[PDB]
Amino acid sequence: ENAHNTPLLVLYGSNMGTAEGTARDLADIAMSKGFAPQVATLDSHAGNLPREGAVLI
């Protein structure tokens, strides 16, 4: 199924991990759907929003 792997960036804002696990879960199902997912915090891509694919927040 590769070649996706469209680019799926998933960003989280989390203090106690609920949102962070949800984010990583999404990135896990993306991998199953051929994407090329990336997981990171929200305020680390501050300004660096992906101008291609899509960004789950």
């Binding site: 070649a3 996706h4 792997n5 991998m31 090329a36 990336q38």
Partner: peptide, 8 residues
């Protein structure tokens, strides 16, 4: 070739 430098 960009996909050759993806995280995976």
């Amino acid at each position: 070739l960009l996909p050759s430098f993806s995280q995976q």
